[PDB]
Design a protein around this ligand. Structure first.
Ligand code: PO3
Length: 496
């Protein structure tokens, strides 16, 4: 096969979540990574993109991200479909959205627009305030636009709400990844968060539209339930649960030859199980993930949860598909317990199995000196766990340590020679990135640390794009980050 990695992931998803195929996950052909003619790797919307400079003077990444938001929206003829994590877009992110909408409206187009945020759960005025602010900023363009704005919470007790970050235009183009539209963390700061989105076009953008219809179908159904949904619309417009299906082709036009698996999850409180699923997982055991006995562990101990959250299985299957090497860049691999379990056992088992077979694993996480942008005190909380899982399959602890130190790179993130930004603040990293075999990679919103949220992303099998990702992001990341490594097989470092 030309697509061995996607083939394996696809087979897993059809066993885990067959009833969600089309809507919460979908394999498509005919896509394109949407880079420019001058810089074809600039589909890779990293921010800030100021490698080597502790003052981050020339933020080529940020500039491209904001320009690409405006460009895609300004090309809209029918729909603009946005999700993110609250707060609603502000600063230059909002400026970019407004500029795009005005550009489309002046080109004569009449648009339907949805903007959905997830938030922690009386009289939430935020959606209505954002609607009215956007309408004022649009000026005459507002006459051409039907707007829906909502904040939603699907489960208070499971801490479940939207955390996908998607921008889809006409079902044709999509931007997605880790980037929240938060000016203070990403833009107006001398210690910007490092993160990444991708830009694509093709049928896979339609998959994102169908995912958003799934979320908006729930949101609209629950719009009268305060505490679940706060909704606001322009004029006398109603809630649009199926804007994508209603307005855009069932299969978007083809734009290239790139195969993609779109995959998300429904978190907790939308749908409890895929009734079509006959998935029968072999669930591992551990004694050090559920920190307290009363916690219901959806990540490790709930078969039904898996069936409505195919993204967890997809990421584990992506790791399991690697023949040569795996690079992982995350805010965290481990979560804060309670209320989440500390780690995904199946994930750590999949990484252990790869290392036991001589496949190289690199994990770069955010510096613990950031502890919202870190959830561990020490890299040992990752390496100890990998070693203990390795012990189960290598026959003991000494053989585990040797396997780990022979096949692992483990470090915290830097983007310049300095241990911190020049302003003295630690580097914060927020990617949700997995790349394997310089072939197939995930960019999206789904963290590898336990999390029970609505998330979304793309798994792309394209060696050319993976090589661009190496050159523009993974290679410079390791150039600077390697100085913090506690384990590095390539230099014989084993301080763990
Ligand atoms: P996310 O914005 O919580 O990872």
């Amino acid at each position: 096969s030309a697509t061995p990695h996607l083939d394996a992931v696809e087979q897993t998803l059809r066993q885990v979540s067959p009833g969600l195929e089309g809507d919460v996950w979908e394999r498509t052909s005919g896509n394109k990574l949407d880079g420019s003619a001058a810089d074809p790797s600039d589909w890779l919307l990293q921010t800030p993109g100021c490698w080597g400079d502790d003052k981050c003077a020339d933020r080529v990444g940020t500039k491209r991200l904001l320009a690409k938001m405006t460009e895609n929206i300004g090309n809209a003829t029918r729909t603009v479909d946005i999700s993110t994590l609250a707060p609603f877009p502000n600063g230059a992110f909002q400026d970019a959205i407004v500029a795009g909408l005005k550009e489309s409206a002046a080109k004569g187009n009449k648009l339907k627009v949805r903007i959905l945020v997830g938030a922690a759960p009386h009289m939430n005025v935020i959606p209505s305030k954002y609607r009215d602010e956007l309408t004022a900023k649009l000026g005459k363009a507002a006459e051409n636009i039907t707007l829906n704005v909502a904040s939603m919470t699907t489960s208070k007790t499971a801490f479940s709400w939207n955390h996908s970050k998607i921008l889809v235009v006409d079902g044709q183009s999509a931007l997605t990844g880790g980037i929240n539209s938060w000016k203070d963390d990403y833009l107006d700061t001398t210690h910007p968060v490092s993160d990444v989105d991708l830009a694509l076009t093709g049928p896979a953008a339609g998959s994102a539209g169908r995912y958003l219809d799934t979320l908006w179908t729930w949101t609209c159904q629950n719009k009268s339930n305060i505490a679940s949904v706060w909704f606001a619309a322009s004029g006398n417009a109603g809630c649009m649960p199926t804007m994508h299906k209603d307005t855009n082709p069932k299969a978007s036009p083809a734009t290239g030859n790139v195969p993609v698996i779109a995959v998300g999850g429904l978190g907790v409180g939308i749908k409890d199980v895929d009734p079509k699923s006959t998935f029968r997982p072999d669930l591992p055991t551990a004694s050090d993930t559920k920190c307290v006995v009363g916690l219901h562990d959806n990540t490790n101990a709930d078969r039904d949860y898996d069936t409505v959250n195919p993204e967890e299985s997809a990421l584990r299957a992506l790791v399991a598909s690697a023949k040569g090497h795996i690079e992982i860049s995350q805010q965290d691999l481990n979560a804060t317990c309670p209320p989440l379990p500390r780690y995904d056992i199946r994930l750590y088992d999949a990484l252990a199995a790869k290392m036991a077979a001589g496949v190289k694993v690199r994990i770069v996480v955010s510096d613990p000196a950031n502890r919202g942008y870190s959830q561990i005190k020490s890299l040992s909380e990752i390496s100890d766990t990998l070693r203990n899982r390795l012990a189960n399959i290598t026959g003991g602890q000494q053989a585990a340590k040797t396997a780990m130190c022979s096949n692992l790179q483990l470090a915290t993130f830097r983007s310049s020679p300095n241990g911190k930004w020049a302003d003295g603040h630690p580097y914060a990293q927020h990617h949700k990135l997995v790349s394997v075999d310089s072939s197939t990679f995930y960019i999206g919103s789904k963290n590898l640390y336990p999390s029970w949220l609505q998330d979304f992303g793309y798994i792309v099998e394209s060696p050319e794009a993976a090589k661009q990702l190496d050159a523009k992001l993974l290679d410079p990341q390791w150039k600077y980050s390697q100085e913090t490594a506690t384990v590095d097989y390539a230099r014989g470092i084993c301080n763990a």
